[PDB]
Design a protein around this ligand. Structure first.
Ligand SMILES: CCCCCCCCCCC/C=C\CCCCC(=O)O
Length: 133
C-alpha cells in the first residue's frame, strides 16, 4: 500500500518553510541554516514497520512506526509529540500532537515526485523531493 513511497529522496524545491518553522517557534538562526539545507529522506519498510530517515548537514532524524499505531516522537526541533502515520486518499499522513497543538506532514506522489505538505496553524509549506538517480 505504501510501496511507491519507498526509497531515497532528495529535496529539490521548498515553499514557505520559514513560515512553517516560525509557526512552531523555531529560532531565527535555526531557520536560517534550515532554509539552505537540502535533506535526503530514506523511507524503508520491513513488513508494516516503516522507518523514515531524514539526513542533512544540519539535523538528522529517524523514526520507526507501524501504520495506524501511535508512537512517541522527538522532532528535529526537539518537540516531544504523540504521532500517528496512516495512508489516507493514497497520501502518507503523519499527524503530531503535543500541548493541544496539531501539525500534519503529508506526503503524496505527483508525476514521480514526492510532495511533502507541512501544516501548522495557518502556515502551509510545500517541499518537493525527487528520487535519487
Ligand atoms: C532533519 C532535517 C530537517 C530539515 C532541516 C532542519 C529543520 C529544523 C526546524 C524544523 C523542524 C520541524 C519539522 C521537521 C521538518 C522536516 C522537513 C523535511 O523533511 O523536508
Amino acid at each position: 500500500m505504501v510501496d511507491a513511497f519507498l526509497g531515497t529522496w532528495k529535496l529539490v524545491d521548498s515553499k514557505n518553510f520559514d513560515d512553517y518553522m516560525k509557526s512552531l517557534g523555531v529560532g531565527f538562526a535555526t531557520r536560517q541554516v534550515a532554509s539552505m539545507t537540502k535533506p535526503t529522506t530514506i523511507i524503508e519498510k520491513n513488513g508494516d514497520i516503516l522507518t523514515l530517515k531524514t539526513h542533512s548537514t544540519f539535523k538528522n532524524t529517524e523514526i520507526s512506526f507501524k501504520l495506524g499505531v501511535e508512537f512517541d516522537e522527538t522532532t528535529a526541533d526537539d518537540r516531544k509529540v504523540k504521532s500517528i502515520v496512516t495512508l489516507d486518499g493514497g497520501k502518507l499522513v503523519h499527524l503530531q500532537k503535543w500541548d493541544g497543538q496539531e501539525t500534519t506532514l503529508v506526503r503524496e506522489l505527483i508525476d514521480g515526485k514526492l510532495i511533502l505538505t507541512l501544516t501548522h496553524g495557518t502556515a502551509v509549506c510545500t517541499r518537493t523531493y525527487e528520487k535519487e538517480a
